[PDB]
Enzyme design. Sequence first.
Site, PDB file in Angstrom:
ATOM      1  N   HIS A  14       0.860 -15.792   3.424  1.00  0.00           N
ATOM      2  CA  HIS A  14       2.208 -15.961   3.954  1.00  0.00           C
ATOM      3  C   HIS A  14       2.751 -14.527   4.155  1.00  0.00           C
ATOM      4  CE1 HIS A  14       6.446 -16.293   3.933  1.00  0.00           C
ATOM      5  NE2 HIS A  14       6.301 -17.562   4.306  1.00  0.00           N
ATOM      6  N   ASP A  16       5.584 -12.887   3.950  1.00  0.00           N
ATOM      7  CA  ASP A  16       6.400 -12.298   2.887  1.00  0.00           C
ATOM      8  C   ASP A  16       5.545 -11.984   1.679  1.00  0.00           C
ATOM      9  OD1 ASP A  16       8.894 -12.470   4.246  1.00  0.00           O
ATOM     10  OD2 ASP A  16       9.255 -14.514   3.495  1.00  0.00           O
ATOM     11  N   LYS A  17       4.653 -12.912   1.334  1.00  0.00           N
ATOM     12  CA  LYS A  17       3.772 -12.687   0.200  1.00  0.00           C
ATOM     13  C   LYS A  17       2.782 -11.549   0.433  1.00  0.00           C
ATOM     14  CE  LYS A  17       5.224 -14.633  -3.453  1.00  0.00           C
ATOM     15  NZ  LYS A  17       5.282 -13.242  -4.026  1.00  0.00           N
ATOM     16  N   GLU A  42       9.020  -0.861  -0.498  1.00  0.00           N
ATOM     17  CA  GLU A  42       9.200  -2.061   0.304  1.00  0.00           C
ATOM     18  C   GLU A  42       8.095  -2.078   1.368  1.00  0.00           C
ATOM     19  OE1 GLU A  42      11.275  -3.616  -1.201  1.00  0.00           O
ATOM     20  OE2 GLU A  42      13.013  -2.343  -1.708  1.00  0.00           O
ATOM     21  N   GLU A  55      10.937   4.695  -1.791  1.00  0.00           N
ATOM     22  CA  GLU A  55      11.042   5.915  -2.570  1.00  0.00           C
ATOM     23  C   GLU A  55      10.049   5.914  -3.700  1.00  0.00           C
ATOM     24  OE1 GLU A  55      13.902   3.674  -2.602  1.00  0.00           O
ATOM     25  OE2 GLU A  55      14.231   4.285  -0.526  1.00  0.00           O
ATOM     26  N   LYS A 166       2.057 -22.787   3.267  1.00  0.00           N
ATOM     27  CA  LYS A 166       3.246 -23.170   2.513  1.00  0.00           C
ATOM     28  C   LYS A 166       3.049 -24.569   1.991  1.00  0.00           C
ATOM     29  CE  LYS A 166       7.281 -21.633   3.847  1.00  0.00           C
ATOM     30  NZ  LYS A 166       8.544 -21.429   4.625  1.00  0.00           N
ATOM     31  N   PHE A 235      -0.607 -25.012  14.011  1.00  0.00           N
ATOM     32  CA  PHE A 235      -0.318 -23.778  13.291  1.00  0.00           C
ATOM     33  C   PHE A 235      -1.527 -22.851  13.440  1.00  0.00           C
ATOM     34  CE2 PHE A 235       1.241 -22.610   8.612  1.00  0.00           C
ATOM     35  CZ  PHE A 235       1.382 -21.278   8.931  1.00  0.00           C
ATOM     36  N   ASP A 243       5.485 -14.725  12.078  1.00  0.00           N
ATOM     37  CA  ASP A 243       6.746 -14.573  11.387  1.00  0.00           C
ATOM     38  C   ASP A 243       6.756 -13.256  10.637  1.00  0.00           C
ATOM     39  OD1 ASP A 243       9.194 -15.467  10.124  1.00  0.00           O
ATOM     40  OD2 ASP A 243       8.055 -16.169   8.388  1.00  0.00           O
ATOM     41  N   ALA A 244       7.742 -12.409  10.887  1.00  0.00           N
ATOM     42  CA  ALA A 244       7.820 -11.128  10.188  1.00  0.00           C
ATOM     43  C   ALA A 244       8.001 -11.361   8.698  1.00  0.00           C
ATOM     44  CB  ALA A 244       9.002 -10.344  10.709  1.00  0.00           C
ATOM     45  N   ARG A 249      11.311 -11.478  -0.355  1.00  0.00           N
ATOM     46  CA  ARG A 249      11.855 -12.606   0.391  1.00  0.00           C
ATOM     47  C   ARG A 249      11.310 -13.939  -0.100  1.00  0.00           C
ATOM     48  NH1 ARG A 249      14.583 -11.647   5.450  1.00  0.00           N
ATOM     49  NH2 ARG A 249      13.894 -13.778   5.891  1.00  0.00           N
ATOM     50  N   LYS A 250      10.640 -13.938  -1.275  1.00  0.00           N
ATOM     51  CA  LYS A 250      10.144 -15.170  -1.881  1.00  0.00           C
ATOM     52  C   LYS A 250      10.529 -15.178  -3.358  1.00  0.00           C
ATOM     53  CE  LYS A 250       8.599 -17.581   1.463  1.00  0.00           C
ATOM     54  NZ  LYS A 250       9.768 -16.960   2.158  1.00  0.00           N
ATOM     55  N   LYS A 270       8.188  -2.286  -7.683  1.00  0.00           N
ATOM     56  CA  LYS A 270       9.110  -1.585  -8.579  1.00  0.00           C
ATOM     57  C   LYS A 270       8.488  -1.344  -9.932  1.00  0.00           C
ATOM     58  CE  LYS A 270      13.096  -3.960  -6.487  1.00  0.00           C
ATOM     59  NZ  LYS A 270      14.196  -4.827  -6.826  1.00  0.00           N
ATOM     60  N   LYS A 274      13.226  -0.357 -13.034  1.00  0.00           N
ATOM     61  CA  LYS A 274      14.016  -1.251 -12.206  1.00  0.00           C
ATOM     62  C   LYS A 274      14.113  -2.568 -12.961  1.00  0.00           C
ATOM     63  CE  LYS A 274      12.769   1.951  -9.055  1.00  0.00           C
ATOM     64  NZ  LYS A 274      12.259   3.274  -9.478  1.00  0.00           N
ATOM     65  N   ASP A 276      15.548  -5.244 -12.332  1.00  0.00           N
ATOM     66  CA  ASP A 276      15.318  -6.468 -11.565  1.00  0.00           C
ATOM     67  C   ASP A 276      14.022  -7.132 -11.982  1.00  0.00           C
ATOM     68  OD1 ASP A 276      17.533  -6.505  -9.800  1.00  0.00           O
ATOM     69  OD2 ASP A 276      16.463  -5.317  -8.280  1.00  0.00           O
TER      70      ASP A 276
HETATM   71  C1  SAM Z   1      19.785   2.218  -7.560  1.00  0.00           C
HETATM   72  S1  SAM Z   1      19.104   1.799  -5.935  1.00  0.00           S
HETATM   73  C2  SAM Z   1      17.496   0.944  -6.294  1.00  0.00           C
HETATM   74  C3  SAM Z   1      16.419   1.841  -6.891  1.00  0.00           C
HETATM   75  C4  SAM Z   1      15.959   2.953  -5.919  1.00  0.00           C
HETATM   76  N1  SAM Z   1      15.214   2.329  -4.792  1.00  0.00           N
HETATM   77  C5  SAM Z   1      15.112   3.979  -6.640  1.00  0.00           C
HETATM   78  O1  SAM Z   1      14.325   4.654  -5.881  1.00  0.00           O
HETATM   79  O2  SAM Z   1      15.243   4.170  -7.842  1.00  0.00           O
HETATM   80  C6  SAM Z   1      19.949   0.330  -5.463  1.00  0.00           C
HETATM   81  C7  SAM Z   1      21.340   0.537  -4.901  1.00  0.00           C
HETATM   82  O3  SAM Z   1      22.148   1.265  -5.849  1.00  0.00           O
HETATM   83  C8  SAM Z   1      23.053   2.111  -5.153  1.00  0.00           C
HETATM   84  N2  SAM Z   1      22.767   3.500  -5.489  1.00  0.00           N
HETATM   85  C9  SAM Z   1      22.034   4.428  -4.792  1.00  0.00           C
HETATM   86  N3  SAM Z   1      22.063   5.626  -5.311  1.00  0.00           N
HETATM   87  C10 SAM Z   1      22.885   5.484  -6.418  1.00  0.00           C
HETATM   88  C11 SAM Z   1      23.380   6.412  -7.355  1.00  0.00           C
HETATM   89  N4  SAM Z   1      23.066   7.710  -7.351  1.00  0.00           N
HETATM   90  N5  SAM Z   1      24.195   5.944  -8.325  1.00  0.00           N
HETATM   91  C12 SAM Z   1      24.516   4.647  -8.329  1.00  0.00           C
HETATM   92  N6  SAM Z   1      24.121   3.683  -7.494  1.00  0.00           N
HETATM   93  C13 SAM Z   1      23.302   4.176  -6.554  1.00  0.00           C
HETATM   94  C14 SAM Z   1      22.906   1.805  -3.662  1.00  0.00           C
HETATM   95  O4  SAM Z   1      23.811   0.748  -3.351  1.00  0.00           O
HETATM   96  C15 SAM Z   1      21.455   1.330  -3.606  1.00  0.00           C
HETATM   97  O5  SAM Z   1      21.219   0.505  -2.465  1.00  0.00           O
HETATM   98  C1  SAM Z   2       8.448 -21.393  10.292  1.00  0.00           C
HETATM   99  S1  SAM Z   2       8.405 -19.603  10.020  1.00  0.00           S
HETATM  100  C2  SAM Z   2      10.182 -19.067  10.064  1.00  0.00           C
HETATM  101  C3  SAM Z   2      10.847 -19.186  11.430  1.00  0.00           C
HETATM  102  C4  SAM Z   2      10.221 -18.244  12.485  1.00  0.00           C
HETATM  103  N1  SAM Z   2      10.552 -16.836  12.131  1.00  0.00           N
HETATM  104  C5  SAM Z   2      10.710 -18.593  13.873  1.00  0.00           C
HETATM  105  O1  SAM Z   2      10.634 -17.634  14.727  1.00  0.00           O
HETATM  106  O2  SAM Z   2      11.079 -19.729  14.143  1.00  0.00           O
HETATM  107  C6  SAM Z   2       8.240 -19.421   8.278  1.00  0.00           C
HETATM  108  C7  SAM Z   2       6.837 -19.604   7.739  1.00  0.00           C
HETATM  109  O3  SAM Z   2       6.326 -20.896   8.131  1.00  0.00           O
HETATM  110  C8  SAM Z   2       4.926 -20.806   8.359  1.00  0.00           C
HETATM  111  N2  SAM Z   2       4.646 -21.122   9.754  1.00  0.00           N
HETATM  112  C9  SAM Z   2       4.439 -20.273  10.811  1.00  0.00           C
HETATM  113  N3  SAM Z   2       4.095 -20.875  11.918  1.00  0.00           N
HETATM  114  C10 SAM Z   2       4.056 -22.215  11.563  1.00  0.00           C
HETATM  115  C11 SAM Z   2       3.683 -23.372  12.274  1.00  0.00           C
HETATM  116  N4  SAM Z   2       3.308 -23.367  13.556  1.00  0.00           N
HETATM  117  N5  SAM Z   2       3.738 -24.551  11.618  1.00  0.00           N
HETATM  118  C12 SAM Z   2       4.107 -24.559  10.334  1.00  0.00           C
HETATM  119  N6  SAM Z   2       4.470 -23.534   9.559  1.00  0.00           N
HETATM  120  C13 SAM Z   2       4.419 -22.382  10.242  1.00  0.00           C
HETATM  121  C14 SAM Z   2       4.490 -19.396   7.957  1.00  0.00           C
HETATM  122  O4  SAM Z   2       4.161 -19.429   6.570  1.00  0.00           O
HETATM  123  C15 SAM Z   2       5.779 -18.613   8.205  1.00  0.00           C
HETATM  124  O5  SAM Z   2       5.814 -17.411   7.437  1.00  0.00           O
END
Ligand code: SAM
Ligand code: SAM
Lengths: 380, 380
Positions: A14, A16-17, A42, A55, A166, A235, A243-244, A249-250, A270, A274, A276
């Site tokens: 998938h 996202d995965k 990311e 980063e 899915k 499919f 699908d991007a 996103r999961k 991460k 982090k 999270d």
């Molecule tokens: C802390 S960052 C996530 C971790 C980061 N990607 C890293 O490289 O450690 C998440 C969010 O916190 C905020 N952030 C960024 N720099 C920060 C800073 N110096 N102090 C506090 N919050 C910050 C921004 O809103 C950012 O999108």
């Molecule tokens: C249906 S797509 C999301 C919507 C899509 N971005 C669009 O342009 O309509 C989400 C996920 O469904 C699955 N998918 C993609 N094509 C599909 C198809 N033809 N039938 C069923 N599931 C599908 C894939 O796992 C994909 O990442």
Amino acid sequence: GTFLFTSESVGEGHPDKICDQISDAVLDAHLQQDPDAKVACETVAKTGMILLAGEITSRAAVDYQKVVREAVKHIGYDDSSKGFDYKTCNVLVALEQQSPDIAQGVHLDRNEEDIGAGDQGLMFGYATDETEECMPLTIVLAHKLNAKLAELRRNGTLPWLRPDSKTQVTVQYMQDRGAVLPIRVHTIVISVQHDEEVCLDEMRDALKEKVIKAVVPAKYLDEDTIYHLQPSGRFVIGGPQGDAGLTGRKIIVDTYGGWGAHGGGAFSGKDYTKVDRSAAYAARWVAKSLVKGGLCRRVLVQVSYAIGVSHPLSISIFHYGTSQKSERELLEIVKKNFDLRPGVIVRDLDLKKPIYQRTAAYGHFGRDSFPWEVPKKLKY
Amino acid sequence: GTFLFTSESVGEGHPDKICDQISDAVLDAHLQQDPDAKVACETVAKTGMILLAGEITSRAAVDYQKVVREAVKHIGYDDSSKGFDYKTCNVLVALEQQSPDIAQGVHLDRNEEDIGAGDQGLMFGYATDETEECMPLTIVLAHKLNAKLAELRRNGTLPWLRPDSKTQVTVQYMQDRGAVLPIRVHTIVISVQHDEEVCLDEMRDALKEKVIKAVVPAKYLDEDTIYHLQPSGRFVIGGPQGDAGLTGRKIIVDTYGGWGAHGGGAFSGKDYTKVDRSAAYAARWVAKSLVKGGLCRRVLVQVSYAIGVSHPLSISIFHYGTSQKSERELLEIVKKNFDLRPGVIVRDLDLKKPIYQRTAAYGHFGRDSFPWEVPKKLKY
Ligand SMILES: C[S@@+](CC[C@H](N)C(=O)[O-])C[C@H]1O[C@@H](n2cnc3c(N)ncnc32)[C@H](O)[C@@H]1O
Ligand SMILES: C[S@@+](CC[C@H](N)C(=O)[O-])C[C@H]1O[C@@H](n2cnc3c(N)ncnc32)[C@H](O)[C@@H]1O
Ligand SMILES: CN(C)c1nc(=O)n(-c2ccccc2)c2cc(Cl)ccc12
Ligand SMILES: CN(C)c1nc(=O)n(-c2ccccc2)c2cc(Cl)ccc12
């Protein structure tokens, strides 16, 4: 007292995965050389493209081209006929160092145990006695259906399968004083990418007989169970081409399938600072410890943090009515038994170990006896 | 019965939120010309870069460079001194048509009311009588704190502010038979990007006096309230330069702040056929209708779908003990009053209207009397 509940899962291919797995392959590659790497990787996937953005501050020398391509190969995207090929895709890198403003506020010149949280945020942990692994049956079954597809793809049983899939499972439950009791499977959805040659009836028959029946106990399936197998009808286009995908996103597939709660943070890509990720793993560990310790049948734990501050700002418990102890009493037991500073979680859960890519498909919880899945013996 | 609960929010210039707003600016631009545009626009942001990735099939002629840059300008990133500038950033586009396999399975040659869901998935709606707008106080206050920062930035009151901000509010509640009653604010976090000249004490004083006191009623603040204001100590680097952003990475900020539940789907960048958005809006509408209709003090609704299938696969209700009616009775009332097919939701909630960019910061719910915020009068 009967009700329905639905959860979904997705396969390794998938889009996202794919991104979560690549992000965690990058994290693991760094941790193999530098256990203290600061990683916030990311991944974005679209037709012919893997982009890394984020980063990283690390002493490791990582070959991003090789790490990304090997992860895609493992997933099974190895030919243009499948819509994506690790050998020939574009790998683009937009990685900078960690912001020095974040670094100075979080970890520079700090004792490890006293490191600050890497961000603010909220996180939840959940556990339910409805399965031995303390997870909701809806999501366990949904994950196992995707794993079965990948197994039959890889062993050549169903060679028309492709990596993108899915699944979705609706269970009919009963309840008893807040605990939940699965009765039957009400509805199953499976959608999986496939080749140009196989027909729809062959796929639907195989999905029922070789996938569902090989995963879901017959006791849960009856003449009324509803099956939506290849419900879109076709499919062939799939993976990032269809699908991007993006990392993180999961997050509900990664956790509890809609049960419990979520604070919003993504796990993959991460390092332990982090919260999270680390605090969600620790919250799972707490919840599972409360259930396996016999204090409750199911439980939800919230924790929260401020960037730069080590101790959590809040901790909260919801036992769904499944404990004789009040939530106040359970919270006191948690505070006596756990220290949820990130610099302590890292030690308890061994979070510098490069096992993260293993977590990035089929859920982070309820599998493989990772440290957060081994209950802590509670004293009270 | 006292407990804590925490929620967060982020500002318009938080990098994930920038992506949600750009995705929805793209969606709105398409809908202004083609009400039936099929849009699945993901945005990625990192230093100097906005990338659009995804799938759009539309009769509109959209100038992506202009739409993206205008959205960034609105947010306030207009100079390299702030870390990002709409005039000079890179805008990259990786947009293809919607997969024809998806199109044929979802909407081609289908009566609109009978269009299939655009994907499988699960979605939740929630409402709570603790505020008039039927939202959790934790997240309402967290959003208002970010809005106040943007207001004081834009009116020149605090000219050292930059667009990237995060806030977090922990409320101490009491409870009564499942309903929740706010007592006081336990902890507030505010982190906001700032210029090189302002000192930390000036920022902390302004954040308490001009931001918190201008938003949070004094009755909730006391000598024990904990303030974490600029807790990292320095936040000059910010926006995409400090942290890569992606669409759909603030799904809990977009919804209920950890309360209720989430099915995992992102809202921004998607037209109504993507039930991740439309069915979550309809589920909010149902939940708010049940609470404003006096059937319960708080309630959670789950709905789920299969790609290509119009009717939901499941609907479920959790009333937290706040109704005299059973959840089975409430579910029957929902089924008698609502039709959650996407082709009916579009009509009830007017989801071809280009108002989506307005939803993409400060939460999708509890604001502006959008159609999903206007309760339906229930018959039973
Ligand atoms: C802390 S960052 C996530 C971790 C980061 N990607 C890293 O490289 O450690 C998440 C969010 O916190 C905020 N952030 C960024 N720099 C920060 C800073 N110096 N102090 C506090 N919050 C910050 C921004 O809103 C950012 O999108
Ligand atoms: C249906 S797509 C999301 C919507 C899509 N971005 C669009 O342009 O309509 C989400 C996920 O469904 C699955 N998918 C993609 N094509 C599909 C198809 N033809 N039938 C069923 N599931 C599908 C894939 O796992 C994909 O990442
Ligand atoms: C026992 N029972 C009836 C349910 N248990 C739950 O844990 N939740 C639930 C899930 C997430 C967040 C909050 C509550 C339910 C939610 C719905 Cl929509 C329906 C039923 C239940
Ligand atoms: C009334 N009360 C005590 C709480 N109400 C709730 O709705 N949830 C909650 C939130 C999300 C999902 C499921 C339950 C709580 C969760 C925690 Cl961790 C602590 C308290 C509560």
